[PDB]
Ligand binder design. Structure first.
Ligand SMILES: O=C1NC(=O)c2c1c(-c1ccccc1)cc1[nH]c3ccc(O)cc3c21
Ligand SMILES: [Mg+2]
Ligand SMILES: [Mg+2]
Length: 259
């Protein structure tokens, strides 16, 4: 053996795990810097799963110049593994910040929600300008590094006009995508970003299915435990409109008067 991973990096700790492998905080020996490295089992060459694994790499290889998307450094294969070395964000995930806030009953305030929405919105405007869509926006895929929010986990990225898509987290999924209608994919990322902001505003954990799931898809915002300006609430509402054409594009969101 004597892995590139082992020889080039000192592994500090495990920071994420899934049915997609694990992510480790590592120090690169030569440059002294800390990176996040995802190490996953290598798919059978030529398989659909390998195509999917490589999309992640290809998406990272083209989305590496934006301040609101986690930067990519390198990727390689060794052993029975594929590895991707990305920028490390020392503030943890948005999900973890929201979970801590939940317990302490002190949520993101309106100014902070607007900042989150604008920052990730800029990240989305960049991804969408590249004719790509993220397809899995949610708090556990947004990382924190003035606070800076960055979109990570490009494992569901695909081209905007793709006839096949892999569905992102059910809790943030727009109905049209579930219905296999891929005519306005970028608006699916907008819908998930609004629900992401709702979670940051202190809402109860989102439904995975059932009656409350359908209600949100009818364009009804979940209850938020704080008073928000009507103008801001209306923007979140239009972002989950049942008609994807009514939702703002990422460009329109970033230029929105409310922000
Ligand atoms: O790319 C990343 N940059 C990161 O800083 C990072 C990343 C990932 C990640 C890496 C590849 C695929 C999907 C997620 C998971 C992650 N979980 C984390 C938990 C804590 C943290 O401070 C950072 C990360 C983290
Ligand atoms: Mg993830
Ligand atoms: Mg993929």
């Amino acid at each position: 053996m004597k892995s590139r991973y082992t020889t080039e990096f000192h592994e500090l700790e495990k920071i994420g795990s899934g049915e997609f492998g694990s992510v480790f905080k590592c120090v690169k020996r030569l440059d002294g810097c800390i990176y996040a490295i995802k190490r996953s089992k290598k798919p059978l060459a030529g398989s659909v799963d390998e195509q999917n694994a490589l999309r992640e790499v290809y998406a990272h290889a083209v989305l590496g110049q934006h301040s609101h998307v986690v930067r990519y450094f390198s990727a390689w294969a060794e052993d029975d593994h594929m590895l991707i070395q990305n920028e490390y964000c020392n503030g943890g995930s948005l999900a973890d910040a929201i979970s801590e806030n939940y317990r302490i009953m002190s949520y993101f305030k309106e100014a902070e929600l607007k900042d989150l929405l604008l920052q990730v919105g800029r990240g989305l405007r960049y991804i969408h300008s590249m004719s790509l869509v993220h397809m899995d926006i949610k708090p556990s895929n947004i990382f924190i590094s003035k606070v800076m929010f960055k979109i990570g986990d490009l494992g569901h990225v695909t081209r905007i006009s793709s006839p096949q898509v892999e569905e992102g987290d059910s809790r943030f999924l727009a109905n049209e995508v579930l219905q296999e209608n891929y005519t306005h994919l970028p608006k699916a990322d907008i819908f998930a970003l609004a629900l992401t902001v709702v979670c940051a505003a202190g809402a109860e954990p989102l439904p995975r299915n059932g009656d409350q799931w359908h209600e949100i898809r009818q364009g009804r915002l979940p209850r938020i435990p704080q008073v928000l300006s009507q103008e801001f609430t209306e923007l979140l509402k239009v972002m989950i409109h049942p008609d994807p054409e009514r939702r703002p594009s990422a460009m329109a969101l970033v230029k929105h008067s409310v922000l």
